[PDB]
Amino acid sequence: QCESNPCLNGGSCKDDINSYECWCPFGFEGKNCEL
Amino acid sequence: VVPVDYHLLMMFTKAEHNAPLQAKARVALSSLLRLAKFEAHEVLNLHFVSEEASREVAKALLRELLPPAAGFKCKVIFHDVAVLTDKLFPVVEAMQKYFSAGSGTYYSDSIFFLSVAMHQIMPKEIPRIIQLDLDLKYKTNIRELFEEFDNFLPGAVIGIAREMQPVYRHTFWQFRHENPKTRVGDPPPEGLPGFNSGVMLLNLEAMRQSPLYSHLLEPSWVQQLADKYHFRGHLGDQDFFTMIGMEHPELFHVLDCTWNRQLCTWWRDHGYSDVFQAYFRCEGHVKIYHGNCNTPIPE
Ligand SMILES: *[C@@H]1O[C@H](CO)[C@@H](O)[C@H](O[C@H]2OC[C@@H](O)[C@H](O[C@H]3OC[C@@H](O)[C@H](O)[C@H]3O)[C@H]2O)[C@H]1O
Ligand SMILES: O=c1ccn([C@@H]2O[C@H](COP(=O)(O)OP(=O)(O)O)[C@@H](O)[C@H]2O)c(=O)[nH]1
Ligand SMILES: [Mn+2]
């Protein structure tokens, strides 16, 4: 198991090796949609 | 009397030195067995998919719980995770890259697709089986779930409850973006929120006998739909059923939410505050609680 990618783009797992952007769902920011 | 067999199947792997999983299993199996009632000529078959260390753990748990109060005949069967993995792999290989954590195709993920090819893994004497998670709490007699098989419309092969979080809202983002009018990923009652694999009525005969279902297993069909839906997941069978459920809802008998009342709220806290309620709502007399994402079950 991996932790779900909080980002809307890339793979299903967070810290997808092949992703460089993180499009966050509304109201979140940060490299893992933390704040 | 002609003896009537009932079949349940649970995954129970890597359970040695995993006390949270053993306690989950204990809660599930003890409520299951306390509340089950079967007629004298009926037998409950409990299938476990386990490597050899989890087989011994399960046996220790089961001997403390069997025979059941209600006194009905119960049989335990173990299936080797390594044997099933090898059987599943030719069928399941091509779907793994879309629905496993994360890339690409590993043997260790193959068993998470067991349900999709259960009709080819189980003896043909087994016409139907109910696959269940071990993080459940049964509030009723499991015998009652089996009558849901009778509600399958022509062409339906699998019974399954909806996913109760907007995980598929999130997963289908790009397809939703390109198709503003889609119901794919929307909440009930009118949207298609996807499925949860915690409780599944696998009609093996109907699965075997469905030409549509058989085609959908083929590498190029899996590939075409995952491309159409821009689908990437890590939840295995749940993902595959959810996806082909978007294309071909006729395959699925949707169970009442009360048969699989998911308690996980992880997605509420990860971008879906405003809509979470519309996915999570479940009303009626709860028959099975599902403590998914390690969520403690109320008592
Ligand atoms: C995203 O990652 C997080 C953090 O690891 C997970 O908690 C999320 O998974 C939860 O939310 C969605 C549910 O679909 C999921 O429960 C299912 O998991 C697959 C099946 O094994 C199971 O029967 C089903 O309940 C839940 O854990 C994840 O989306
Ligand atoms: O190490 C593990 C992890 C999972 N499971 C089985 O697979 C199911 C899926 O995991 P779980 O239900 O804990 O996660 P959920 O997907 O429901 O959040 C469990 O009920 C177990 O039956 C297992 O046997 N060993
Ligand atoms: Mn579960």
> Whose atoms come closest to the Cα of B235: which ligand?
1
Q: Name the residue range of residue A33's domain.
A: 1-35
| Structural domains counted in chain A | 1
Sign of the Cα pseudo-torsion (B112, B201, B249, A5, in order): negative
Structure tokens belonging to residue B237:
């069978």
Q: B231: number of CA atoms within 13 Å, CB side?
A: 34
Is any atom of ligand 1 closer than 6 Å to the C-beta of B293?
A: yes
Expressed in Å, this structure's resolution amounts to: 2.1
Q: Are B146 and B6 in contact (CB under 8 A)?
A: yes
Q: B201: number of CA atoms within 13 Å, CB side?
A: 26
Q: Give the pairing type, strands B252-255 and B136-138.
A: unpaired
CA A30 to ligand 2 center in whole angstroms: 30
Q: Which residue has the tokens 């028959």?
A: B287
Task: Name the interface residues of B facing A (CB cutoff 8 Å).
Answer: 101-103, 167, 170-171, 173-174, 232-235, 266, 270-273
Sign of the Cα pseudo-torsion (B82, B84, B86, B88, in order): negative
Question: In angstroms, rounded to a whole number, what is the distance separating the alpha carbons of residues B212 and B108?
Answer: 28
**CATH for A20:** 2.10.25.10
Q: B3: number of CA atoms within 13 Å, CB side?
A: 8
Other Cβ atoms within 10 Å of B108 Cβ, number: 10
Q: Give the pairing type, strands B136-138 and B288-290.
A: antiparallel
Q: Which residues of B233-252 are buried (b: 16+ CB within 10 A; e: fewer)?
A: bbbbbbbbbbbbbbbeeebb
Size of chain B, expressed as the number of residues it contains: 299
Other Cβ atoms within 10 Å of B188 Cβ, number: 15
Q: Helix or strand or coil: residue B4? A: strand
Q: Are B131 and B119 in contact (CB under 8 A)?
A: no
Longest pairwise C-alpha distance within chain B = 59
B43, B17, B15, B42: which is closest to B28 by C-alpha?
B15
Q: Name the residue range of residue B206's domain.
A: 1-299
Which residue of chain A is at minimal alpha-carbon distance from B104?
Answer: A11
| Structural domains counted in chain B | 1
Question: In angstroms, rounded to a whole number, what is the distance separating the alpha carbons of residues B59 and B74?
Answer: 13
Q: Are B36 and B72 in contact (CB under 8 A)?
A: yes
Sheet holding B136-138, edge to edge: B136-138, B288-290, B261-262
Q: What is the DSSP letter of B282?
A: -
